[PDB]
Every structure is written in structure tokens, then in C-alpha cells.
Design a protein around this motif. Structure first.
Motif, PDB file in Angstrom:
ATOM      1  N   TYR A  85      46.668 122.888  13.477  1.00 35.62           N
ATOM      2  CA  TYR A  85      46.848 123.463  12.119  1.00 35.62           C
ATOM      3  C   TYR A  85      46.061 124.775  11.977  1.00 35.62           C
ATOM      4  CZ  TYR A  85      48.826 118.825  11.751  1.00 35.62           C
ATOM      5  OH  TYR A  85      49.582 117.714  11.982  1.00 35.62           O
ATOM      6  N   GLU A  86      44.928 124.926  12.661  1.00 34.09           N
ATOM      7  CA  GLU A  86      44.118 126.177  12.620  1.00 34.09           C
ATOM      8  C   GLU A  86      44.885 127.334  13.273  1.00 34.09           C
ATOM      9  OE1 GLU A  86      41.217 126.469  10.859  1.00 34.09           O
ATOM     10  OE2 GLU A  86      41.894 124.512  10.165  1.00 34.09           O
ATOM     11  N   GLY A  87      45.671 127.054  14.322  1.00 36.27           N
ATOM     12  CA  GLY A  87      46.545 128.075  14.936  1.00 36.27           C
ATOM     13  C   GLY A  87      47.661 128.487  13.992  1.00 36.27           C
ATOM     14  N   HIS A  88      48.360 127.508  13.426  1.00 32.71           N
ATOM     15  CA  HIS A  88      49.489 127.723  12.488  1.00 32.71           C
ATOM     16  C   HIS A  88      49.056 128.661  11.355  1.00 32.71           C
ATOM     17  CE1 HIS A  88      52.201 125.238  14.636  1.00 32.71           C
ATOM     18  NE2 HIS A  88      51.734 124.051  14.233  1.00 32.71           N
ATOM     19  N   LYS A  89      47.812 128.531  10.874  1.00 27.44           N
ATOM     20  CA  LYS A  89      47.292 129.320   9.721  1.00 27.44           C
ATOM     21  C   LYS A  89      47.220 130.802  10.070  1.00 27.44           C
ATOM     22  CE  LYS A  89      44.823 125.426   7.630  1.00 27.44           C
ATOM     23  NZ  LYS A  89      43.498 124.803   7.386  1.00 27.44           N
ATOM     24  N   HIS A  90      47.267 131.176  11.345  1.00 27.44           N
ATOM     25  CA  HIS A  90      47.196 132.623  11.727  1.00 27.44           C
ATOM     26  C   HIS A  90      48.547 133.329  11.562  1.00 27.44           C
ATOM     27  CE1 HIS A  90      43.150 131.859  13.169  1.00 27.44           C
ATOM     28  NE2 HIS A  90      43.008 133.179  13.147  1.00 27.44           N
ATOM     29  N   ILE A  91      49.652 132.579  11.478  1.00 27.47           N
ATOM     30  CA  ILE A  91      51.029 133.149  11.638  1.00 27.47           C
ATOM     31  C   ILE A  91      51.304 134.162  10.523  1.00 27.47           C
ATOM     32  CG2 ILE A  91      53.495 132.698  11.718  1.00 27.47           C
ATOM     33  CD1 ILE A  91      52.743 129.888  12.929  1.00 27.47           C
ATOM     34  N   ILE A  92      51.267 133.751   9.264  1.00 22.81           N
ATOM     35  CA  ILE A  92      51.652 134.659   8.148  1.00 22.81           C
ATOM     36  C   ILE A  92      50.720 135.866   8.053  1.00 22.81           C
ATOM     37  CG2 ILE A  92      51.934 134.847   5.663  1.00 22.81           C
ATOM     38  CD1 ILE A  92      52.841 131.652   6.084  1.00 22.81           C
ATOM     39  N   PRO A  93      49.376 135.714   8.025  1.00 24.94           N
ATOM     40  CA  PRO A  93      48.490 136.881   7.929  1.00 24.94           C
ATOM     41  C   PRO A  93      48.617 137.828   9.141  1.00 24.94           C
ATOM     42  CG  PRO A  93      47.177 134.801   7.886  1.00 24.94           C
ATOM     43  CD  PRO A  93      48.647 134.435   8.020  1.00 24.94           C
ATOM     44  N   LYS A  94      48.822 137.287  10.340  1.00 23.99           N
ATOM     45  CA  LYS A  94      49.102 138.131  11.529  1.00 23.99           C
ATOM     46  C   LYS A  94      50.426 138.872  11.339  1.00 23.99           C
ATOM     47  CE  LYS A  94      47.101 138.875  14.804  1.00 23.99           C
ATOM     48  NZ  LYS A  94      46.279 140.084  14.984  1.00 23.99           N
ATOM     49  N   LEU A  95      51.451 138.213  10.808  1.00 19.13           N
ATOM     50  CA  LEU A  95      52.762 138.881  10.629  1.00 19.13           C
ATOM     51  C   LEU A  95      52.621 140.057   9.662  1.00 19.13           C
ATOM     52  CD1 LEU A  95      55.706 138.958  11.371  1.00 19.13           C
ATOM     53  CD2 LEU A  95      56.129 137.129   9.699  1.00 19.13           C
ATOM     54  N   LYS A  96      51.904 139.860   8.552  1.00 12.79           N
ATOM     55  CA  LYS A  96      51.598 140.942   7.578  1.00 12.79           C
ATOM     56  C   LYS A  96      50.865 142.096   8.283  1.00 12.79           C
ATOM     57  CE  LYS A  96      51.108 142.763   3.472  1.00 12.79           C
ATOM     58  NZ  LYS A  96      49.874 143.585   3.505  1.00 12.79           N
ATOM     59  N   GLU A  97      49.830 141.786   9.046  1.00  5.11           N
ATOM     60  CA  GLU A  97      49.078 142.809   9.815  1.00  5.11           C
ATOM     61  C   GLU A  97      50.066 143.565  10.713  1.00  5.11           C
ATOM     62  OE1 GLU A  97      45.560 141.229  11.804  1.00  5.11           O
ATOM     63  OE2 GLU A  97      45.925 142.676  13.421  1.00  5.11           O
ATOM     64  N   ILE A  98      50.939 142.876  11.457  1.00  8.65           N
ATOM     65  CA  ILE A  98      51.894 143.612  12.340  1.00  8.65           C
ATOM     66  C   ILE A  98      52.820 144.488  11.496  1.00  8.65           C
ATOM     67  CG2 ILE A  98      53.797 143.390  13.966  1.00  8.65           C
ATOM     68  CD1 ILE A  98      52.239 140.768  14.936  1.00  8.65           C
ATOM     69  N   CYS A  99      53.261 144.029  10.323  1.00  9.05           N
ATOM     70  CA  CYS A  99      54.187 144.822   9.468  1.00  9.05           C
ATOM     71  C   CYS A  99      53.519 146.155   9.090  1.00  9.05           C
ATOM     72  CB  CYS A  99      54.619 144.064   8.214  1.00  9.05           C
ATOM     73  SG  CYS A  99      55.748 142.682   8.557  1.00  9.05           S
ATOM     74  N   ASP A 100      52.250 146.117   8.709  1.00  5.80           N
ATOM     75  CA  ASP A 100      51.521 147.312   8.191  1.00  5.80           C
ATOM     76  C   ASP A 100      51.322 148.315   9.332  1.00  5.80           C
ATOM     77  OD1 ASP A 100      51.564 146.428   5.540  1.00  5.80           O
ATOM     78  OD2 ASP A 100      49.659 145.251   5.833  1.00  5.80           O
ATOM     79  N   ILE A 101      50.918 147.853  10.514  1.00  6.59           N
ATOM     80  CA  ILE A 101      50.807 148.708  11.730  1.00  6.59           C
ATOM     81  C   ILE A 101      52.178 149.299  12.027  1.00  6.59           C
ATOM     82  CG2 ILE A 101      50.279 148.750  14.186  1.00  6.59           C
ATOM     83  CD1 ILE A 101      48.574 146.048  13.414  1.00  6.59           C
ATOM     84  N   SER A 102      53.196 148.436  12.121  1.00  7.58           N
ATOM     85  CA  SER A 102      54.571 148.836  12.500  1.00  7.58           C
ATOM     86  C   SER A 102      55.093 149.870  11.503  1.00  7.58           C
ATOM     87  CB  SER A 102      55.493 147.610  12.589  1.00  7.58           C
ATOM     88  OG  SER A 102      55.005 146.706  13.573  1.00  7.58           O
ATOM     89  N   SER A 103      54.840 149.679  10.204  1.00 13.50           N
ATOM     90  CA  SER A 103      55.316 150.627   9.164  1.00 13.50           C
ATOM     91  C   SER A 103      54.746 152.025   9.432  1.00 13.50           C
ATOM     92  CB  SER A 103      55.001 150.168   7.776  1.00 13.50           C
ATOM     93  OG  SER A 103      55.874 150.820   6.868  1.00 13.50           O
ATOM     94  N   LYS A 104      53.497 152.134   9.887  1.00 13.72           N
ATOM     95  CA  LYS A 104      52.865 153.464  10.133  1.00 13.72           C
ATOM     96  C   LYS A 104      53.500 154.111  11.362  1.00 13.72           C
ATOM     97  CE  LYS A 104      48.434 152.455   7.841  1.00 13.72           C
ATOM     98  NZ  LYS A 104      48.852 151.233   7.105  1.00 13.72           N
TER      99      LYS A 104
END
Length: 237
Positions: A38-57
Motif C-alpha cells: 500500500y505504501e508503493g501504491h500511494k506514490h502513483i498519483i503524486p508521481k503522475l502529477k510530478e511527471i505531468c508538470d515536468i512534461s508540460s515544460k
């Protein structure tokens, strides 16, 4: 009948415009930290947001991310229950962001809570003009092809098209993931398979597999995948 020799066109006419993400490695990441899955699963959404912001730039326009495969339904109730609860957090992470969020997949099988969060998320973000994040939730390649086939059968039985009208372009318009298709697929966690993510949409996609686990996948890892994508074009373009 069939004829391929006079069929030109091509679906939807150096930076990849559309990236497909298989966000694997989270369970493995948790186990080798000595943490519950469950501690791994909790990384998915916040990591996806982080990738979106990098990718957008970097000027990437679309991310399609494999959040929840149909295979998840074969795990312990508690694990499925955790995951379906957890994805409500899509509202919290994205509703007040600059990312446009769509979901693809069979919403009807999800709790109405998740269904409504999903519906609120699409509604509040619908006007954002930056990166488009497509979240594949209860989604499969087979599923997309079958729902498209069903839609075309209906049209035909109501005299809307003839069998001779069925082509690449008509079929594509009926899929939940439409062209422009992914230029680049990135899969973290070391497996070299697409696991029934997208099938139709991956026909000309560049495949990039990394041993990096999704929770360790950062701006450096993403720029490396993109530079690899650019060298492949210099070699084969």
C-alpha cells in the motif's frame, strides 16, 4: 473482399507529442524498502502529477497513463478496495491544477464515489489548455477494440454505414484513445511487455523499457527517455 495496395492516408496525418506510461515497479519499490504494498501504491498519483508538470515544460501535449488494468480485479478484495478508494485522490491532486484530465475505461464498474470524483475532475479541469492527461482506469486494449466493434455493428444495423465504409479512420473515431497516438511508450519496473495497455494505438510507437521503479522515476529519467527517443529518429527517421 480486401485491398491494401491503393490505401494511402495514415492516421492523423524531435519532442514526442504524446507519451504512454505504464507505471510499474511500485509493489517491488515497497517490498525492498520493507514497506507494505500500500505504501508503493500511494506514490502513483503524486508521481503522475510530478511527471505531468515536468512534461508540460518540455512541450509534451498528451500523457496516457495505465492507472488500473482489468487484471487488478483478480487481487484480494482489500487490495482492490484500497486501490478503488485511493483513486478518489485524483480529484485532490488534479482539480486545482493546470492539467486537463480525461478518464477512459469502463466507469460503470467503479464505485459511484469514484465515478463522481472522476466526473468532478473532468468537469473542473475541462478548460485547462496545457497538458492533456488521459487516465486509463478499468481499461484494456481488447476492451477498446471490442467497444469500437460494437459501436460500428450498431451503426450498420441502423443503416448509417456500409461494410465498405469500415476503414482505419472510421474505426479510430470509435476508440476511447484516438490519434494522435503515442510517439513514445515508457514502462518502468523492468518488464518488456505492453500488458494489454493499448494495442491499436501502439502500431508505430517507440518502446522504452527502464529498470527504474515508478516511485524513483524523476525529471532526469524522463529527459534520458526523450534523448533516447531523439537518437532513434536520427538513426531511423
Amino acid at each position: 473482399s480486401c485491398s491494401l495496395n491503393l490505401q494511402t492516408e495514415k492516421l492523423c496525418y524531435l519532442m514526442p507529442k504524446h507519451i504512454a506510461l505504464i507505471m510499474d515497479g511500485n509493489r517491488r519499490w515497497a517490498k525492498d524498502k520493507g514497506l507494505e504494498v500500500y505504501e508503493g501504491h500511494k506514490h502513483i498519483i503524486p508521481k503522475l502529477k510530478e511527471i505531468c508538470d515536468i512534461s508540460s515544460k518540455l512541450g509534451i501535449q498528451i500523457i496516457t497513463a495505465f492507472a488500473f488494468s482489468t487484471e487488478n480485479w483478480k487481487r484480494s478484495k482489500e487490495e482492490v478496495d484500497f486501490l478503488l478508494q485511493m483513486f478518489e485522490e485524483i480529484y485532490d491532486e488534479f482539480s486545482r491544477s493546470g492539467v486537463r484530465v480525461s478518464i477512459i475505461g469502463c466507469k460503470s464498474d467503479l464505485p459511484m464515489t469514484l465515478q463522481k470524483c472522476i466526473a468532478l475532475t473532468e468537469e473542473t479541469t475541462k478548460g485547462n489548455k496545457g497538458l492533456h492527461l488521459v487516465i486509463a482506469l478499468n481499461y484494456g486494449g481488447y476492451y477498446d477494440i471490442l467497444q469500437a466493434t460494437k459501436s460500428i455493428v450498431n451503426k450498420a444495423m441502423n443503416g448509417l454505414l456500409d461494410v465498405e465504409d469500415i476503414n482505419k479512420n472510421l474505426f479510430d473515431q470509435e476508440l476511447e484513445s484516438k490519434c494522435p497516438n503515442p510517439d513514445l511508450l515508457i514502462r518502468t519496473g523492468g518488464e518488456q511487455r505492453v500488458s494489454n495497455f493499448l494495442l491499436w494505438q501502439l502500431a508505430y510507437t517507440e518502446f522504452y523499457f527502464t529498470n527504474t521503479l515508478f516511485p524513483d522515476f524523476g525529471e532526469e529519467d524522463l529527459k534520458e527517455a526523450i534523448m533516447n527517443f531523439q537518437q532513434r529518429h536520427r538513426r531511423f527517421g
